[PDB]
């Protein structure tokens with residue numbers, strides 16, 4: 001497990017509240033406020049999930065071997081409802097639970113480049129106390145292409161070799177604003193931002 | 198950390214290895230099939246050596262062994278499929294998003310008996326009459342009865358909604374099938390090519 005994590009004392013899961021003024025808090029706040037300056041952060045929690053981390057790190061090493069470069073990982077946003085937060089914290093992102101996107105590039109889990117997109121009430125639905133929830137997520141975007149609404153996996157790179165797949169898809173390869181991933185353990189929920197108007 | 202019985206792959210990460218008829222391994226797998234499918238004709242048995250699928254599976258097995266505090270979480274089951282799905286399963290394993298009836302939930306189905314997987318609706322005969330069935334290592338873990346429309350196994354106690362059963366079945370006392378809902382809970386270990 002990463003050496004900067006808090007000691008969980010044999011436990012496999014912990015949410016750690018970050019302190020404003022620490023570099024770790026400030027980098028996430030700045031990434032958020034770059035496009036969400038009209039909202040205010042209540043708190044930022046580091047997600048320490050040993051099993052999700054292990055499974056994600058195995059997929060990352062595999063993708064780093066296959067693609068024969070790094071640059072497979074992006075830090076993206078995912079807005080969700082309060083009812084989903086316990087499941088995501090413990091089990092991560094499940095495509096079987098994903099809603100249809102208003103612009104669909106495939107049947108998978110969606111991640112935004114900009115916090116403003118994830119901050120829409122459609123995604124980060126305000127709870128009964130007006131709190132909105134957004135994850136900051138390590139996503140294995142790898143090698144990507146423009147998606148299509150019918151996809152249940154990324155498309156093949158070559159139609160004559162249908163099993164050799166792109167890693168993810170996007171809305172626009174030249175100016176990506178979202179990514180869709182179709183497999184478990186391709187996304188690690190790293191931070192949970194709780195925020196309000 | 199690849200199994201001793203795998204054959205050398207000359208520094209590659211994926212190989213389908215045809216088994217030698219009459220040796221220990223071929224005999225063991227053939228016997229599991231002929232237990233219930235002795236009226237079929239076996240063309241060949243192939244060992245699936247997929248390093249990445251194996252790594253991902255072994256990590257989930259180690260996690261399930263810790264979570265359940267025992268090492269009885271794995272079963273050897275059967276899965277019939279059509280010829281056009283075989284290259285995908287060999288490379289990528291099983292995908293619940295590529296669904297036949299799903300009465301016990303929206304997962305991947307595995308049969309206890311090869312005879313069940315040998316039905317033409319599962320192991321669809323190709324243009325040459327050939328049928329395809331995997332012998333699969335499945336992390337069934339702690340299981341409960343399934344039902345239509347599950348996207349994950351149910352919780353073990355509704356007081357902790359995120360502490361789930363590992364798999365579901367048709368019948369907890371005498372199971373004939375299992376359903377798993379997560380990638381890398383099943384490792385396709387052998388592919389049997391056969392005819393009626």
Ligand SMILES: O=C1N=NC(=O)c2cc(OCC3CCCC3)ccc21
Pocket residue numbers: 275276277278297298299300301306307308313314315319320374
């Ligand atoms: O071998 C199989 N390959 N693909 C399947 O979908 C499958 C499904 C299966 O049980 C399906 C249930 C039986 C009663 C209602 C639903 C058993 C085996 C296989």
